[PDB]
Amino acid sequence: MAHVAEWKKKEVEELAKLIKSYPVIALVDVSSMPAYPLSQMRRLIRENGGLLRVSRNTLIELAIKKAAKELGKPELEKLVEYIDRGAGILVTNMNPFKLYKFLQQNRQPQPLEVGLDVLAVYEDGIVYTPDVLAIDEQEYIDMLQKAYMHAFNLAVNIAYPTPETIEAIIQKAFLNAKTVAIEAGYITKETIQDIIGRAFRAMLLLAQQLP
């Protein structure tokens, strides 16, 4: 049915129910995609729990669905309706972060690549901007390892003993005692060899004063 309308609150009516049907509502930029590549993107989105709709002003009407319920996803109490020219609306059960990654990694469809750029994503009271959605995975991995090391270092240093820390605690206390004893030149079975090494090197250096 495309001989004519284009009808308002037949198209916006349908889009209405649609937005109310899915937990995750994104605005995407479709302008970079030729018709067939976009068609392939639509198929992919369908196979992954969602769908894409293209329209213009009747898309603005995130308002009628927001009104028909309780939120702040619309025009009204929202931010800066991230809509642009040739924005489409993509409704999905995919988590907003998953959606963003999905769209980034599926430019499908010679080595030219094109896709859908996310403008903003609404879920349960919050609008997610691309800067929030764009996760630095290595940063999270690094921070996780840093936090683990902080806990390990703290526990060892205070001698809080756990299977993870007990051997390092024993070795640290021993190394502390051995290092202090060698520095003080105090003779034990455990320190005599490093001490003789110091004394031998002192002899070697001292001998260097001879002509």
Binding site: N95, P96, F97, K98, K101, D124, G125, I126, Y128, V132, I135, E137, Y140, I141, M143, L144, Q145, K146, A147, Y148, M149, A151, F152
Partner: protein, 58 residues
């Protein structure tokens, strides 16, 4: 960094790092809710083998 310590805590006690568990741990520490940071943390850690990450210890 409270999100990462909350995750490590949960992992160390055999609990799933999900929004509910993360929120409860953070709340108990008097931390105000930040849905975007909670959800981002969960997304970042999805599919991540935490035990492997930890054994690589750097």
């Amino acid at each position: 960094m409270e999100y990462v310590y909350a995750a490590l805590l949960l992992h160390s006690v055999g609990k799933e790092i999900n929004e509910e568990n993360l929120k409860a741990v953070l709340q108990a520490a008097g931390v105000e809710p930040e849905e975007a940071r909670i959800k981002a943390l969960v997304a970042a850690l999805e599919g991540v083998n935490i035990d492997e990450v930890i054994e690589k210890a750097a």
